[PDB]
Amino acid sequence: GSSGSSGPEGSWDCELCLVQNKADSTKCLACESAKPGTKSGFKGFDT
Ligand SMILES: [Zn+2]
Secondary structure, three states, X not given: OOXXXXXXXXXXXOOOOXXXXXXXXXXXXXXXXXXXXXXXXXXXOOO
């Protein structure tokens, strides 16, 4: 559900060096790369 769900939530696992990182942190620590994410402002069909 919403609270307590099966699966690691929060921390984001890196792909470049394949090393775990802190949620708050935006970039990696081992490779110092840019965390995979999207741009600000949701997208969709609107007028
Ligand atoms: Zn990394």
